[model samples]
Target: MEFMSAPANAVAADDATAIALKYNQDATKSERVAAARPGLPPEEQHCANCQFMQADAAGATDEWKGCQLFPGKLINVNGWSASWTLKAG
Candidate 1:
C-alpha cells in the first residue's frame, strides 16, 4: 500500500503565514513613537504614512492628525507608538 500526505488544511499551521511577522512592542518602542509624531514630516517620520494609519475614500493626511491612537496625545522623543493596537492574541 502507498502512503499519502495529510491535506494541506489539516497540516497547515498559523506560523506558516508569511504575513505573520512579529513586531515586538517592548523592543521597538523608540521607533514606533517617532513614527507616530504628528506633523513631524511624513517622509522624515512614519506617523502619517504608516500602513495602519486610517484614511478615507481619498487618502491619509501628511500630519497624521486623525490617527486613532495619537489623535491628540502629546508624544516626546522617548515616546511610544500610540498607534500600537491589539487586533488579536
Candidate 2:
C-alpha cells in the first residue's frame, strides 16, 4: 500500500526553489524578520500586509500565501524583506 498527500494549491518544487534562490528567502518568518532590517516597524513590514501578497481568496487570512514577486511560491505572513511595500490605499 502507498499513501500520498499534497495540498490542493501546493507550489511545485522547482518554482519554490527558483524563488528561494532568486530572493534569498529564509525558511521561516523569524529568519526573514531578523534579516530584513526594514525602516518600518517589524509589525508593519510583514508579507501579509504587503502590496504584493496574494491570498487564496478574497478576505482569506491564511498565514502563508503567494506573492506577485515570487509567483507559484507561498510566503510567510510574518516574513519581511527588502522588497516589502505597504499595501496601497
Candidate 3:
C-alpha cells in the first residue's frame, strides 16, 4: 500500500493501513467526515481543524499538522480526507 510521491524520496498512501487509519470518503465504507459527506451544508474541515489532529507546540501555526490518524505524516489543513469533521460549535 506504499506509493512513491513525485520526488520518489517521499511516500504516498491512498488510504491509511495502520492502527489509526484515516480515510477519505472515497475509501472508507462506514466512517464519515461531515465536511466531505453529502446532505450536510458545505463547510470547511481539515486536519488542522479536526479534533484528532495534534497541535504543534512549536508554533507551527495553521499550516500542516501531525494527525493521530496517520502517524508520522503531516497533513494539510485544507486537504480533504475521509476523516474530516467539522469543529464542534
lDDT of 1 by residue, 1-83 (tens): 44533222211223232113222222243344444445443224333334343443122233212334433321222112434
Which regions in candidate 3 have their CA more than 4 angstroms from the true location?
Answer: 1-35, 38-40, 57-61
- Mark the regions of model 1 whose C-alpha exceeds 4 Å error after superposition: 1-45, 57-64, 70-89
lDDT of 2: 0.55
- Tell me the deviation in Å of residue 46 in model 3: 2.3
| Model 2 regions lying over 4 Å from their true place | 1-39, 57-61
TM-score of each: 0.22, 0.51, 0.46
Worst 10 residues of 2 by lDDT: 21-30
Worst 10 residues of 3 by lDDT: 4-13
lDDT (tens digit, per residue) of candidate 2 on 1-89: 33432234433445544456333233343344555545566545666777887887432345557777765556566555557776883
Residue by residue across 1-89, what tens digits does model 3's lDDT show?
34522222111444334224444322223244433554343344445556666665333335545566656555555444555555552
Number of backbone-clashing residue pairs for each candidate, in the order shown = 0, 0, 2
Candidate 1 differs from the real structure by a C-alpha RMSD in angstroms, to one decimal, of 16.9
Stretch of 10 with least lDDT, candidate 1: 10-19
The pairs that clash in candidate 3 are: 23-82, 24-82
* Every model: Cα RMSD to truth: 16.9, 6.1, 7.5
